[PDB]
Design a binder for this molecule. Structure first.
Ligand SMILES: CCc1c(C(=O)NCc2c(O)ccc3cccc(O)c23)[nH]c(C)c1C(C)=O
Length: 119
């Protein structure tokens, strides 16, 4: 469409926060994603050489709380950025990679009816 529907901040928050909470509820799968990757603490100094645009659950939560999303696709894009970052950097045998794959399955399931409700 050429006429982008306007979403109120609280409309986006009420619709989308339950899908973020569904990711947070995955335990242990969400544990590596609840805070930004700290490459120095984690002993992986090559991280920012590979991941140019970091993203995590706490950043997305803050963006939802502060009205930084004007439409739901922006929120979906940030969640997918988090996923694609983990699938890019981590080896396929690693816990973070397999945990990412589980979160993406959960997010796909939860986000579909919500995007239909938002129109
Ligand atoms: C591997 C480092 C890393 C974490 C992380 O936080 N590792 C430390 C960690 C925890 O802080 C809590 C639970 C973990 C459960 C398994 C493996 C971990 O490592 C875990 N999160 C992301 C997105 C990455 C990368 C590079 O993509």
């Amino acid at each position: 469409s050429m006429r982008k529907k306007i979403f109120k901040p609280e409309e986006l928050r009420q619709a989308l926060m339950p899908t973020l909470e569904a990711l947070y509820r995955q335990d242990p799968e969400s544990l590596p994603f609840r805070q930004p990757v700290d490459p120095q603490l984690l002993g992986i100094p090559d991280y920012f050489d590979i991941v140019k645009n970091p993203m995590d659950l706490s950043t997305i939560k803050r963006k939802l709380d502060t009205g930084q999303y004007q439409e739901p696709w922006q929120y979906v894009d940030d969640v997918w950025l988090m996923f694609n970052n983990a699938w890019l950097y981590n080896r396929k045998t690693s816990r973070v990679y397999k945990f990412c794959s589980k979160l993406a399955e959960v997010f796909e399931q939860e986000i579909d009816p919500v995007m239909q409700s938002l129109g």
